[PDB]
Write a protein that binds this ligand. Sequence first.
Ligand SMILES: [Cl-]
Length: 241
Amino acid sequence: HTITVSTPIKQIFPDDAFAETIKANLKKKSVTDAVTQNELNSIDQIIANNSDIKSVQGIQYLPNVRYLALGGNKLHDISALKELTNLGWLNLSNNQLETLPQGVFEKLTNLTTLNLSNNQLTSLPQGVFERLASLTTLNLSNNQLTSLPQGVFERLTNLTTLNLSNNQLTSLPQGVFERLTNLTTLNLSNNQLTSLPQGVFERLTSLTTLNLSNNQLTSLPQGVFERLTNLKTLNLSNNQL
Ligand SMILES: [Cl-]
């Protein structure tokens, strides 16, 4: 969005903590001070971790923000982020996100890092990451996921780090990692996996670290790790093999 007349920071950003962040960023004396769209356009990063922010309403007016560090707040809604097309790094770790709108990330074509760890996500909508062609890092650890939709990572061809640890996954679709040919780190530890699908890691030729610790695996398929020629670290501890 855009403002056509100078407007008080608190009018645009209703959350007092977030308004304070904007005030500090723009070097203003008070959150009641008026700002211009040109000043809002000058913002390319917001660092506000552990700031008790409940809402980022108003962020829609910052077209140029590229780095958004909002870890450790009280966010439940991130719909205001949808049209921030210049976003490259989004840290939403440790908030109170329970669900993700299906198309909330559809416009973030420049996003390379997405940290959604330590939230309370119970599911991933099909295609929620479909347009994140530039993504290299996806951290979904410490959530409440029980299953992954097939194809949920299929367009993330440039992904190098995928952290799915500390969830409650009880299965893995067979071709769920099929397109991640550049993946170097895959963390599946602390889940409830009892078996691994045949060929589940077949195409991860760049993989160097695979963590499957703290699951409930009783058996490993024959040659399940055979095509991982660059594998350097394989953690299988605390299972039932
Ligand atoms: Cl981060």
